[PDB]
């Protein structure tokens, strides 16, 4: 049968133009009050995943 | 495929376009004798194409003859045989194809 896309993956990750995988930096969902402004802000930026894990994630989104 | 197949058979000289079949109204020995005046005594195999149940009927039953209608031209059958003896509307259906 058709493979199914991992919905959890499609909700967390993005495939870029050139193949990279992209996600949101972890560690500002809570416990924020004491975290530095430098910390709090750097956790905005999307980050690129390291290839072996990115590549694995990729196989989970067959249709994109 | 269909282009190349015929294209090869011609390139070898073993093609032959014919206008209509003289003394042959669906009766083997007739065709048999027509083919004689045609330049094939069946020492080589013939792929034979025309929409003309009459012609290809006398032309059935012979070992060295593979019968065909012209919309049913196919590349196994071409290569399969030794000598293609097509025909003119057969030729235009085949030409209506490679377009």
């Amino acid at each position: 049968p058709k493979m199914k896309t991992h919905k959890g993956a499609k909700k967390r990750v993005k495939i870029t133009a050139s193949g990279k995988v992209v996600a949101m930096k972890t560690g500002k969902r809570h416990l924020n009050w004491q975290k530095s402004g430098k910390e709090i802000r750097q956790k905005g930026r999307k980050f690129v995943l390291a290839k072996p894990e990115a590549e694995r994630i990729k196989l989970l989104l067959p249709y994109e | 495929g269909l282009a190349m197949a015929v294209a090869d058979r011609a390139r070898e000289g073993k093609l032959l376009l014919v206008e209509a079949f003289a003394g042959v109204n669906g009766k083997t020995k007739e065709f048999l004798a027509w083919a004689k005046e045609a330049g094939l005594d069946g020492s080589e195999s013939v792929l034979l194409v025309t929409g003309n149940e009459l012609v290809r009927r006398a032309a059935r039953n012979l070992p060295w003859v593979v019968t065909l209608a012209p919309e049913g031209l196919n590349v196994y059958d071409i290569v399969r045989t030794e000598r293609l003896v097509m025909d003119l509307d057969a030729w235009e259906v085949f030409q209506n194809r490679i377009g």
Binding site: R12, T26, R29, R56, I57, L59 | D8, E12
Partner: protein, 149 residues
Amino acid sequence: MKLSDLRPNPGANKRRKRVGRGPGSGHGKTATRGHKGQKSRSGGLKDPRRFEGGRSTTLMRLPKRGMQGQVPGEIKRPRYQGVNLKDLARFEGEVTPELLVRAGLLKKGYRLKILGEGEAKPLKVVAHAFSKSALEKLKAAGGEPVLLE
């Protein structure tokens, strides 16, 4: 060029790897699975694309971004599509949506919008909208934009 001349090009039909067939062959006995463990077993190994030993999987530690939407459907609405200027060089005269579609340029059922990467050939073009800077290269290169509906 007969039947015993028909023959595939050099390796367009490889033979197949055949494990389980004696010593010399190279992969007999274990038949390449090495020795024991889950991954030997007739069955797997669970999904190598996400299972991480029982650990919290490297995917699911990552957060989730933005609207996932919810029942009943997705909102249906005007979808667009980008066709450039460098594309319309392959035409002369007027250019319309449905035309552009047939060209193998436009995905049908999306409202064409013209965006300008390139050079505007003196043309009349009909888009559902124009990227501000396609309007530019196009007008001043002697052409006529038709914002249609």
